[PDB]
Write a protein that binds this ligand. Structure first.
Ligand code: A1D5D
Lengths: 55, 335, 236, 284, 125
């Protein structure tokens, strides 16, 4: 009980001292990554049967 | 005198995460063009399974895939010719997961038995035989995937995960941070990190080399059933029984998007992103699969091809098609 | 026309399909059951009385043959306390044989709660449950002793009456019969409240030494097969 | 009193035809549109509904023929209408027996069953039933013609070249044997064996007495043998009396025909509405 | 994050009444089934009471049936338990458990030793 509690406290202390960024920058990076590979997505951009192997 | 420090540190972490909450994902992506109606059609129908299908896994060549059926048989399915390539008899009928090696030479499987067995497919004998058996766990294996030809991760129901070595077959790395039964895990593209979701309404990020948990994400209201990594390697979506999907970013350490609906009162069983990650296909217990927008959080498409509980959903490496398997013992390819 | 490797692929697929045909035949020719029970129930004696490698095994399989029909009973091995996730793997089983100790009045409430949880499960609502009330002689001795009362744990025992449809065994105290019928009723009130005709319970009384449980299990499996055949055909 | 009786008979024919068309259309809609075709029983019920709809589509031809006592359509058209009527009736009375035998195999030989209820086997059985119905109606196709009366009216009949005093009785007996004797007997035997096996299994596992969820299927089996016998047996009895001894009784013949189609209209009702397997789709 | 805070315990002579209050945070209180269990020194977990989402389906165990009264408060997401006529054998730690899946009638893992959706419990003597 005491050992597990001390281990959990040490784990929380180790995980607290980490580097974090803002949510806006992460959202912008995710949007840029989604827009950069939007053309390379067969589900988002359908292709005719000439290139579709599941024809 | 010990719980007070833990609770005050948790409150400090929550305040620090709230302070960094500048805006939301829906607010930034509110003035973009939507994806519209994403309607998919069934191209191939795979028949031959006897019992209910529980899991599946595609290959790196986007041609052959592996599936797990509780009748005690693993079938290698072809996505093009729909022909059965290999039939592997299992010693244990209660299977719950299956994996495919990146090189296409080994296949993993596990279940109620505490062994994630690996079977070879390119041996000199031609047929399939028992290649390796990883024993030592005290709980049922929920999912064990491959990372390379030397190491293999295993997630067991005993609240612990284990990275084993294929050459030695012993416990190379252990992870004893989770408190609930580890339900699912997703590897990072760089083969260095992995996010695991257990029966504790929380996910944890672990390293294959450090062997310690650096990030822990909370927010769910029930047990997380499935988890998938984002193609960019910075975020991941988690689905639970509370009919809500939550997107957590590693670099941001905060929830980004929440997918939910009023008419959805069923839990999520499987989640997987496309090649770009714009669309997220989530399987529900209402016999249908929903396609949500990663930026608009809107229902893009409904798949009502299966008549039973959707169990597994897998997107190819190139995002050409999606393989869905339910308890009806049918694998359906949608495009 | 087809290529050279396509013919070999088609031949391999046809061979695998012909093998899966026999696999499905063997699978349908054998019935599967789910054995459940607490540690105090004593299911080891029930497993050892059935006649035809790692220490960390979480599932055991016992194969036997009754009336030329093969039955494979599955027993839970080394598993943790949480049993809400992997139980969904037993959605396609024929029956759930649940064993309850009757000589332990303190855990009767826990047994009833477990039976209610299994019976009211979303995925177990179409699977029949066979109740085995083990340790009948111990319950009879505990009732004849008189050192412990039953109404202290269940007030309904003070108001329950022996039904007219009871079948008392030759040479048995009426108090033990009343107690066992009250226990059976308490167990069946949960199965009759959420039955709705889709599933039913099979109450049975199992003693310490008994060589007739196999025939009872066979009859219950036959009844479940008849019920599912009547339900799938819409004669039901 | 002939005109009023004819008007009443035609109104009853129209009402029965409308009810049967409505019922068969609803059953076919529930079966096909809701995508509920996976077992042999569903395919058999669909074929039964198809046969009943084809019978109720030919009923208006009969009512228009009897509204004016003649047949203003020709001989080939009468032959075609009678052949279609006959093949639909025989296909229905054969698919009922086939469904009864399938249910018998399913409850009493549950092993060999899992092997014969494949969809391809069901389609082959349906095709064989249609072929057998066609073979049975083959004489009705070649012997049915049109006859001109003394008043110039042309009506549908069954004119045989050889003296009818020997062939007519034989045809009546063959139709009786193929319609009531074999099918009703087989259905009754299969259902009695089902009930007996069910009761034996229920008493075999120490089930509580008088706990009866089987009363519904018992009453359904009784209805299956009652609403079929009481409707079809008089249809053959009237015809046997009018061929053997009686000279002409149009009233009882029309009543028997009306009772037969009412049976053909109520069979899909009893087989799909109270079968508990399509009621759930109706609830949707 | 799931959080269950129980309070209202303490030491009381046999025969008195107590009012246990459980506050839930991090999830919908009205969309889950609630259970109250007890743990005594020297014995395992024992189920005491169960209440559904709408509060209609309420069940108690035969050992304390008729004395304990459980109730819900959706306006503040609170679970109240009034305990009258306490016996000297009621000295135990009470815990509050929540059902894992919403809109379900299952009651699994409510008596398990390791359960995340459970508070710290309150001592009653
Ligand atoms: C008095 C007559 C003159 C002879 N010298 C003697 C005959 C031989 C009886 C004349 N034989 C008929 O008159 C026809 C023929 C026939 C007989 C036996 C079985 C039949 C089954 C299906 C088709 C026709 C059959 N007998 C009829 O009973 N029916 C009504 C059939 C029916 C079908 C389903 C349910 C109830 C009744 C056909 C009349 C008809 C005409 C136009 C459209 C539809 N139906």
């Amino acid at each position: 009980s005491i050992a597990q509690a001390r281990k959990l406290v040490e784990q929380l202390k180790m995980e607290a001292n980490i580097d974090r960024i803002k949510v806006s920058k992460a959202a912008a990076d995710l949007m840029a990554y989604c827009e950069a590979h939007a053309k390379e997505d067969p589900l988002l951009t359908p292709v005719p049967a000439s290139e579709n192997p599941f024809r | 005198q010990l719980r007070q420090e833990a609770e005050q540190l948790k409150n400090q972490i929550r305040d620090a995460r709230k302070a960094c909450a500048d805006a939301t994902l829906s607010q930034i992506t509110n003035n973009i063009d939507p994806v519209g109606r994403i309607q998919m059609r069934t191209r191939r129908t795979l028949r031959g399974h006897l019992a209910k299908i529980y899991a599946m896994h595609w290959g790196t060549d986007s041609r052959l895939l592996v599936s797990a059926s509780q009748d005690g048989k693993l079938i290698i399915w072809d996505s093009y010719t729909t022909n059965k390539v290999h039939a592997i008899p299992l010693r244990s009928s209660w299977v719950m997961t299956c994996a495919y090696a990146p090189s296409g030479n080994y296949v993993a499987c596990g279940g109620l038995d505490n062994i994630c067995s690996i079977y070879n497919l390119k041996t000199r004998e031609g047929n399939v035989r028992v290649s390796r058996e990883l024993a030592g766990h005290t709980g049922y294996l929920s999912c064990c995937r491959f990372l390379d030809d030397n190491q293999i991760v295993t997630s067991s129901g005993d609240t612990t995960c284990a990275l084993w070595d294929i050459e030695t077959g012993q416990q190379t790395t252990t992870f004893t941070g989770h408190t609930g039964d580890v339900m699912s895990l997703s590897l990072a593209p760089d083969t260095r990190l992995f996010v695991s979701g257990a029966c504790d309404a929380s996910a944890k990020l672990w390293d294959v080399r450090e062997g310690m948990c650096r990030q822990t994400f909370t927010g769910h209201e029930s047990d997380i059933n499935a988890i998938c990594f984002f193609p960019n390697g910075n975020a991941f979506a988690t689905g639970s029984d509370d009919a809500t999907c939550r997107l957590f970013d590693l670099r941001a350490d905060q929830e980004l998007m929440t997918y939910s609906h009023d008419n959805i009162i069923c839990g999520i069983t499987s989640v997987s992103f496309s090649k770009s990650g714009r669309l997220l296909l989530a399987g529900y217990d209402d016999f249908n699969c929903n396609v949500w927008d990663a930026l608009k959080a809107d229902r893009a498409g409904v798949l009502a091809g299966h008549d039973n509980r959707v169990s597994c959903l897998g997107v190819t490496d190139d995002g050409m098609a999606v393989a869905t398997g339910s308890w009806d013992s049918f694998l359906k390819i949608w495009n | 026309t087809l290529s050279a490797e396509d013919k070999a692929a088609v031949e391999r697929s046809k061979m695998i399909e012909k093998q899966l045909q026999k696999d499905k035949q063997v699978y349908r020719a054998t019935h599967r059951l789910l054995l459940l029970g607490a540690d105090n129930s004593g299911k080891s004696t029930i497993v050892k009385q059935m006649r035809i490698r790692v220490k960390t095994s979480g599932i055991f399989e016992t194969k036997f043959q009754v009336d030329k029909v093969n039955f494979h009973m599955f027993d839970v091995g080394a598993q943790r306390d949480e049993r809400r996730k992997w139980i969904q793997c037993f959605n396609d089983v024929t029956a759930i044989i649940f064993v309850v100790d009757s000589s332990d009045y303190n855990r009767l409430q826990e047994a009833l709660n477990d039976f209610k949880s299994i019976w009211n499960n979303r995925w177990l609502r179409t699977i029949s449950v066979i109740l085995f009330l083990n340790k009948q002689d111990l319950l009879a001795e505990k009732v004849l002793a008189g050192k412990s009362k039953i109404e202290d744990y269940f007030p309904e025992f003070a108001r329950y009456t022996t039904p007219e449809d009871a079948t008392p065994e030759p040479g048995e105290d009426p108090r033990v019969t009343r107690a066992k019928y009250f226990i059976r009723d308490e167990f069946l009130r949960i199965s009759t409240a959420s039955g709705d005709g889709r599933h039913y319970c099979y109450p049975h009384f199992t003693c310490s030494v008994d060589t007739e449980n196999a025939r009872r299990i066979f009859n219950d499996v036959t009844d479940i097969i008849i019920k599912m055949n009547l339900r799938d055909c819409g004669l039901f | 009193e002939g005109q009023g009786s004819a008007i009443l008979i035609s109104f009853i024919y129209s009402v029965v035809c409308l009810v049967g068309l409505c019922g068969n259309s609803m059953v076919i809609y529930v079966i096909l549109r809701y995508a509920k075709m996976k077992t042999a029983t569903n395919i058999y019920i669909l074929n039964l509904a198809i046969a009943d709809e084809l019978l109720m589509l030919s009923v208006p031809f009969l009512v228009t023929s009897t509204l004016l006592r003649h047949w203003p359509f020709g001989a080939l058209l009468c032959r075609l209408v009678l052949s279609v009527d006959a093949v639909n009736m025989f296909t229905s009375i054969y698919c009922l027996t086939v469904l009864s035998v399938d249910r018998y195999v399913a409850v009493v030989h549950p092993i060999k069953a899992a092997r014969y209820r494949r969809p391809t086997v069901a389609k082959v059985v349906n095709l064989g039933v249609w072929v057998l119905s066609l073979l049975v109606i083959l004489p009705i196709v070649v012997f049915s013609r049109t006859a001109a009366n003394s008043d110039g009216t042309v009506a549908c009949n069954m004119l045989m070249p050889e003296p009818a005093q020997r062939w007519l009785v034989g045809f009546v007996l063959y139709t009786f044997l193929m319609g009531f004797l074999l099918p009703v007997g087989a259905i009754c035997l299969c259902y009695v064996l089902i009930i007996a096996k069910m009761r034996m299994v229920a008493l075999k596992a120490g089930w509580q007495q008088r706990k009866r969820s089987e009363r519904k299927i018992t009453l359904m089996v009784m209805m299956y043998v009652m609403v079929f016998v009481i409707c079809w047996m008089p249809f053959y009895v009237v015809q046997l009396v009018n061929v053997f001894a009686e000279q002409d009784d149009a009233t009882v013949s029309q009543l028997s025909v009306i009772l037969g189609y009412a049976n053909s209209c109520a069979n899909p009702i009893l087989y799909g509405f109270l079968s508990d397997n399509f009621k759930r789709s109706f609830q949707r | 994050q799931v959080q269950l805070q129980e309070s209202g315990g303490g030491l009381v002579q046999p025969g008195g009444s107590l009012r246990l209050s459980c506050a839930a945070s991090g999830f919908t209180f009205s969309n889950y089934k609630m259970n109250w269990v007890r743990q005594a020194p020297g014995k395992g977990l024992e189920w005491v009471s169960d209440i559904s989402q709408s509060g209609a389906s309420i069940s108690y165990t035969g050992s304390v049936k008729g004395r304990f009264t459980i109730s819900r408060d959706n306006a503040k997401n609170t679970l109240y338990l009034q305990m009258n006529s306490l016996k000297p054998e009621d000295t135990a730690v009470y815990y509050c458990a929540r059902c894992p899946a919403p809109f379900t009638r299952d009651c699994f893992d409510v008596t398990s030793t390791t359960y995340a959706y459970r508070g710290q419990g309150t001592q009653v003597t």
